[PDB]
Structure formats: structure tokens, C-alpha cells
Amino acid sequence: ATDQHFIAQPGVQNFLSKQWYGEISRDTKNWKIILCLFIIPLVGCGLVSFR
Amino acid sequence: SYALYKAFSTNEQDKDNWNGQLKLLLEWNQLDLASDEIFTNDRRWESADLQEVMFTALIKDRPKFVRLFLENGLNLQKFLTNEVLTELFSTHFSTLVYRNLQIAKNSYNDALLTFVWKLVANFRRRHPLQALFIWAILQNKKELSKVIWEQTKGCTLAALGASKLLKTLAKVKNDINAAGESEELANEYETRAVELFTECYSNDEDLAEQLLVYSCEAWGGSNCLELAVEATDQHFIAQPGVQNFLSKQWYGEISRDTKNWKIILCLFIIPLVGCGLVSFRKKLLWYYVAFFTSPFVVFSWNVVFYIAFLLLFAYVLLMDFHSVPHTPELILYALVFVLFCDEVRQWYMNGVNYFTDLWNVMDTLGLFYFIAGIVFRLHSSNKSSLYSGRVIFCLDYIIFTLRLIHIFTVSRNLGPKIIMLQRMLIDVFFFLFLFAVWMVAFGVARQGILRQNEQRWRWIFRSVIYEPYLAMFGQVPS
Amino acid sequence: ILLVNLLVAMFGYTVGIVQENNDQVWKFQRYFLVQEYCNRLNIPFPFVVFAYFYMVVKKCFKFRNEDNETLAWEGVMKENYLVKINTK
Amino acid sequence: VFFFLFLFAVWMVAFGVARQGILRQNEQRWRWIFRSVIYEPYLAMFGQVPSDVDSTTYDFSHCTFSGNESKPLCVELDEHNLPRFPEWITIPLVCIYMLSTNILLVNLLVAMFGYTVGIVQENNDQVWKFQRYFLVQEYCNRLNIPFPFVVFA
Amino acid sequence: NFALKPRMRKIFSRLIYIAQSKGAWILTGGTHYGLMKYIGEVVRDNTISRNSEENIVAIGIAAWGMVSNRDTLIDEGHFSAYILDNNHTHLLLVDNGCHGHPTVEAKLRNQLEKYISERTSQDSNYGGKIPIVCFAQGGGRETLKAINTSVKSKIPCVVVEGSGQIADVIASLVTSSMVKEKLVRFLPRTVSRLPEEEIESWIKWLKEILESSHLLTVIKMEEAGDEIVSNAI
Ligand SMILES: [Ca+2]
């Protein structure tokens, strides 16, 4: 219907963001995520939360 | 509740049990009935055994009942012991509030939140009402907190600290409902602190400025004027009371109701301090020293020193720069040593957050490029080194000249626009992103259509990047 | 033409928003410069190093009643403001 | 206008002194200091793109080798009689200056003009018809003839 | 024990503001209990707020038999723990024999009230004579005895409220029968212990009360806004 006000509300946005990040918690800063993307064996360190 | 109270009253033996009546009217929300039928006749009270019903009304969120109790009398410091605090933080403190507190401590640390993390680690294992107010405010109780806040002495300090705590806890991204209500209550208490201090200033200005500067026996170990800064409560400082305080601290001894051109004209002619053109309201040698101690004119002296420094650096760099250092280069080195001492003194009095501001970062960076210019400049008879030192001095003069924008942010006229200037970075970055995309997409296509297999790296970037860049200023690639 | 005159429009809109916040942020920034200039007890700048030596001179050698009085003053207008809330 | 001129003067001086110090060596004539530090970065606001920084389009027919005639000095030469200044430090310097003055700083002045026009328009008619009183009174204060004969009156 | 509902709080705060605005003395019991405590609190608040411009005068009048610690000097003493109130700036304690005797202070108090009522000070709009107003809001024997000792003298200017124990029975009725059936419907819980041989004397007390009803006025329940204390006095 292009009911864009139903998707602009924070519930559907919270759902879409939690589906977008996936396993990573939203309360980490994204530079840590791309820095862990650059250094592949840094996935095993306490800098990102996989909650 | 009224039926159970009528049956509980007419047994004719438990009428002397008014404690059971009060507890029954506490488990239900009968405020008016208990007020009209327990406290009205003033025949019976002790003001000391009301503590169990007090603890029950506190832990079960009965704000009108604790208001009615404190209206008839109980001292909170007599009521509170450390064991009550351990029961409140050990049992009645929620675990989801603890999880949001620890996530906020992991992501957003600050001195007040470090202090409340230390004290919650204390009481999960001398200011009673403030700690109970803290326990009320982290739970988002929103109605008991007002009741205890009306009983505090250091009221504005408590309101500003609670606003800081709730604004910091409102930034946690899971449990968005609790973050929303903490945001609401934070706005409520910053409004409350502003609207109380406007009355405290609008009656007696001197005692309001007495209020602003007291630490209240290490409330959170800070000051009332500092808690608004640490929370970035910029509406508390935008009000005319704190602005009047800051302006009267800024001018110092000079009255504010004189025109500032008289002040700078008296700065230019030094023995004109003894004349009736400036008012020193807020003997003559005291006038001399009180003039040369004011913050306004020591800033206005330091900016004239800085402009004279820039003119001397320009003369040295453009017109007198030889193999051996002449006299103005040595005078220049002395002035840079004085600026270096001032900046390292500001770093020693500031600490590690000195590197927070980018202006201090580029000041340190400029001093480092200056000493690099010296150590390239002193190795004489090597023309490559003696030219490279001057190149480093030019690229340093750029930094020292661009500091002048940050210097002149104090003005009433240029100031707000310079502060506005930093809100434009996102539009500039959007422009540069789109222009870089069109630049590359045109430059590679034109270089590939015109020529064949350029092997020199410099004439790739002069023809792909540089000429479509110049085509933004109206060049029309030839 | 298009990409520059779009930047003009975005600058104009951003100037349109931030102007009522502009004076607040400026007189918030006024506090930091007032405090960093009043934190120092110094002479004029070209002699500050001598005064700095004075501090080196230092480094070469080295409950209250009116508090509760002004807090008790504060509580009166606190009660007055509570009346001013519940009156309106 | 004063905010624009302040920022443009700061960028002007910070670019002109750096370019004059990187290119040449010990100019002793005061006129060719201010023609090269102040005047050419000023012309770079109208889209001129200061020419003396490219090191490929720089000829020695516009130099002097010593201050003897009109023209500016040369960039200081090598032992191989080549220019010494790096292209990789003077080309991006001119690019950053030209961006920061010819585009950002002018289109910010457009935005501030637009906002000021947005405010003062409801006060504009009031201030104009307040100013109308002064001209009406200064023209009605005189009992004179037409102007070329006023001296007779 | 004393219950202080917020209407009485507003009334007495406005009263002490009036007493500061007019430059008046306030005579009170002067103990550390309930109403006298709160009057002393508002005296201290109006002292700490303005710090000047006629610091107000509150004389407490106590019995000397109820005081816990009593120290005889000529040399100031310290009073810590009836109990005397901290914030009344003048205290007068009547002398008697043994300790357990209430209502001793009332005689010298009412005689002083009559003496100021006959004392003439010209700089006032009352034709001199220093006008005097008596209040009562609570309950007990002493309120009725004070109001009747005042109204038996000329010019008491008695003002009562419609809130309290005896304030209700004085406010509501405006002979013996109505006194009885209003006194039992508003106060049973004190008359449960009291014999009728002095309740007939209470009816005589109230009969002397309602003799001159022009010297008695009341603050009603609809009259509950601001400036209601000036409108009564
Ligand atoms: Ca600095």
C-alpha cells in the first residue's frame, strides 16, 4: 500500500535493525565491526558482542 | 477496601489496633479514609513506631502515604540505616535496571556514573537522603522521587545530578521503553532545576551566586555549576542568572555598564588607567593592579601578542631567512618557547582530556612541526635540508594562522557564527562524495577515450583527478 | 551548476534550523573560556614564564554555619516554587 | 559581510604566506610581497586559480633573478637549474584553498543572506515608513523655490 | 500530637507574613510541640529569608512545671533534651508551686492582654489603643477557657476557623440543647471520659461565648483562597 508511516514507527525499525545486524548487538560501535572485518582472526576477542 | 475497613473497625476489640487499620488502608490505596479516620483527632500517635508502615509504603510505591506520614512527622536519617540500604539495593533493586546500568558503564563511563557504580557495588554488599533519592531515581519511580526531593537541602545539586544520571542511562539501546521514560524524567528534572534557580536568582542575586559554587560535602564530589556542564545541560547555563554571573566574573573589577572601546583604548594608553572614563566598581596602585589582573584585558593582551607573533613569523619566513639564524629568528624561537610553556602548563593542569579538544591537538601538532623545522634548519650547508626546513615552517604557519578562528570565538558578533560553522560538515561531506563520484566517472572515461596506455603515474592523476576537479571552478576541460 | 546550487540549498536549510540553538551553544561555550582564563593566576603573557618560575619556586619549597544558612535560605524559595506549581 | 571578510582574510593570509615561502626566497621589495600574498589569493575568490604552482607551465620569461625590473622573482632553483618546490605539496594546497574559499565560504554567505532576509521582512515596512517621517519633515521645514534658484531664496 | 493539614499550613504562613508586614507581636504557648513548633519554624523561615526589615517578635508563655531541664543563672544556658521551642525569640515562664499544674500561665497572659487593650499608642488607625486579635483552631479545655476569658473582657476580636475540634463546634452553631447535640456529634472521643458536672459548666462557658457574637467571626470553608486571613482580622 506504500504505508510508509507504519514502517517509520520505532517498532518496525527496531525489528529491521535487529534483523540487519543479526548476531551482533546494536549497542556496540560500528568502527569495531569494520575493524574486525579488516583483521579476520580478531573475531575471537572481547570487543564485539554476539548476544 | 471500605467494606473490609468497616468490618475491621466494628469488632470493638481491634479499635485500639490502629496499626492494623493503617496497614489495611496501606495495602489498598485509601488515602482520604486513613487521613480522615486515623490522623484527624490527634488523640493518638508516637512519631517513632511509624517505621514499619513507612518501609512498607516505600517498597510498595505509596507516594501519597509517605507524604501524609511526613506531614505528621518522621525524620528520614533516623529512619535510614545501612541495612535498609542493603535490603533496597540487594532485594528491591531490579536486575534489568542492573543490566542497563552495567551496559551503560561499559559504553558510557563518566565520573558521576563511576561514582554511582562504586556506591551500588558498596550497597549491594553522611548523606542518607541523597542515596535514597538515587535509589528512587534509577528505578524510574517518578513520584516518590519528588516526595524525597522536597525534603532535601541541596536541592538544585540533586536535580542536576539526577538529570545527568538519567540522560546517561537514556542512551542504552536495548529496552527502549525504560530509556524513553528515563529521558522524560531527565527533561523533567532539568526543567525543575532551571525553574528553581530562576527564583533563587530573581530574589537575591548574591545568595544565588553563593549557591552556585558549593560542593555540599562531596555530594558526588562536584559542584552545582559543574554538574550542568558534565551533563551538557546547556539550558541551565543559557539562562540570564548564570550568564550574568559569568559576565561579572569575566570583566572582573570593571563595571559592565561602560563601553568596551574605552577599555581597549585604556589598554593602548597605559597611564590612562588613572582617569574618569572607566568604572572600577565591582588606591591608584590598586587600580593599576586590578586592571592588569582582569581576565578580559589579559585575553585582549594575549591576542595582540599573538597577532604580533604572526607578523614576526611572516617577516622571518618571507624576508629574512638565511643559512645562519639572525636576530628575529632567535626572538621568534623565544616566543615559541613561551607559547610551548603555556601549552604544556595547560596540559599539566588539564591531564588526559586535554587531547579531547581538537584545537589542543593541532596546537601540539603545530609545536611539533616547529621543532621539526628547527632540527631541519640547523643542519647548515645542506641546501635540501635548509629548504625542507622552510617548507615545514610554511606548513606550520598555516596551522598557527588557522588557530585565530578559534581565538576569536569569544566575540558577541563573530562568536555564534563561528560556533554555527561546525554544524555544516555533513553537507560538505555529501557534496564531496557526489563530486568525487562524478569526478572519477568522467576522468577515467575521458582518459580512456582520448589516449592509449599512459605508463606514468603522475600524468594519470593530473588528467583523471585534477582537471575534472578544476572543472568545478568553471574551466571547461580543453 | 546542479551540485553546487544544491549545496547552497542544504546550507540555507541548516542555517534555518540551528539558529535558535546557536545562542545556547555559544553561551554554553562561554563557560569553558571563562574558567580556563580564571584558573590561572598569571601576569601578562610575554612574562608568564617568570610567573611560571614562581610556581617552580613553589615546587622548590613545597558542617559549616553559613553553608547551612544559605541552604536554609534556598528552602524558602523551594517551598515558594512548590506553591507556584500547585497554584496555577 | 564582516563574518565573510574575517574568514576570507584568515584563509587569504594563511595561503599567501605559505605559497610565497614555499616558492621563492627572500623577497626584499615590499610591493611584490603584497601583490603575491594578498592580491593573488584575493583574485582566487573570483575563480582565477593561482598559476604559479604547477612547475610544468612555469616559464622563466616572467622572472627577474634579482630585483631589478618589474616582474616577480623566480622560484629558487636547483644545482641542476630546476625548480625545487614539490608539486605534491603545492597542487593540493591550491586545491584545498580554492575549495575552501570559492565554494564553501561564498555559498555560506548566500545562506546567511537568505536567513537575514527571512527575518527582517516583517520589520522592513515598519522601519521604512518610520524613515518616511524624517524626509517629509526635512522637506516641509523649508519654504523655498525649486533648487537651482534656492540661493536667491 | 498535632495534625497540620495544608490549608492550615497556608493559613499560618500567610498569618506570619501578615505579622511581618504589619510589625506585630505574636503571643503563643511556646513549647516544642506541634503548632508552636511550626509557628517557630515559619518565624525562622521569615528571619532567614529577608534577614532584616523588622525581625518579628514571638513571645512564648510557658508554665515552668512541665520543662524537663531547668537551669538557674543570672551567664547563658543550654537547653537540650514539656520541651521549650527553639525559635521563639522571647520566653516568659510563670512561677508556681509544684510541677504538674497546667493552665497556670493563662491568668498573667490574659491580664497582659487586657493591659495592652487599655494601653494607648497613638500612631495607629484604631484611634490608638493597640488593637488585639485572638485566634483558636484546635481543641481542648484551654482553648474555650482562653476565648471566654478574652470575650469576658472587652475587645478580644475573636477569630475562629471552621477546622479543628472546638473550631467546628463554635463555627457550626452560628441554649444548652444545641450545644449538647453539636458537641457530641463533633467530639465524642474526648467527652467519653468527662462527667456532666463540668459539661454543664462548659455549657455556661459557651453561653458566655455566644453573648457577644459581634466579637466572634469565622473563616469558612468556601472562603479558602488567598488573602482570607486579612479578610478575617
Ligand atoms: Ca590550548
Numbering used by the authors:
A (entry chain B): 663 to 713
B (entry chain A): 409 to 533, 558 to 714, 722 to 917
C (entry chain A): 969 to 1030, 1045 to 1070
D (entry chain D): 867 to 1019
E (entry chain D): 154 to 227, 232 to 238, 251 to 343, 350 to 408
The authors write:
Transient receptor potential melastatin 8 (TRPM8) channel is a Ca2+-permeable non-selective cation channel that acts as the primary cold sensor in humans. Each MmTRPM8 subunit contains multiple domains, including the N-terminal four TRPM homology repeats (MHR1 to MHR4), S1–S6 six transmembrane helices in a domain swap configuration, TRP helix, and C-terminal coiled-coil.
We first determined MmTRPM8 structures in the detergent Lauryl Maltose Neopentyl Glycol (LMNG) in the absence of ligand at 3.0 Å resolution (MmTRPM8LMNG-ligand-free), and in the presence of Ca2+ at 2.9 Å resolution (MmTRPM8LMNG-Ca), Ca2+ + icilin at 3.0 Å resolution (MmTRPM8LMNG-Ca-icilin), and Ca2+ + icilin + PIP2 at 3.2 Å resolution (MmTRPM8LMNG-Ca-icilin-PIP2). In the map of MmTRPM8LMNG-Ca, strong density shows that a Ca2+ ion is harbored by the cytosolic-facing cavity in the VSLD. In addition, the side chain of Tyr793 from the S2-S3 linker is positioned in proximity. The distances between Ca2+ and CG atoms of its coordinating residues Glu782, Asn799, and Asp802 remain 2–5 Å in most time of the simulations. Thus, the simulation results support the binding of one Ca2+ ion in this cytosolic-facing cavity in the VSLD of MmTRPM8. Therefore, it is likely that PmTRPM8Ca is also in the closed state, similar to the Ca2+-bound MmTRPM8LMNG-Ca structure.
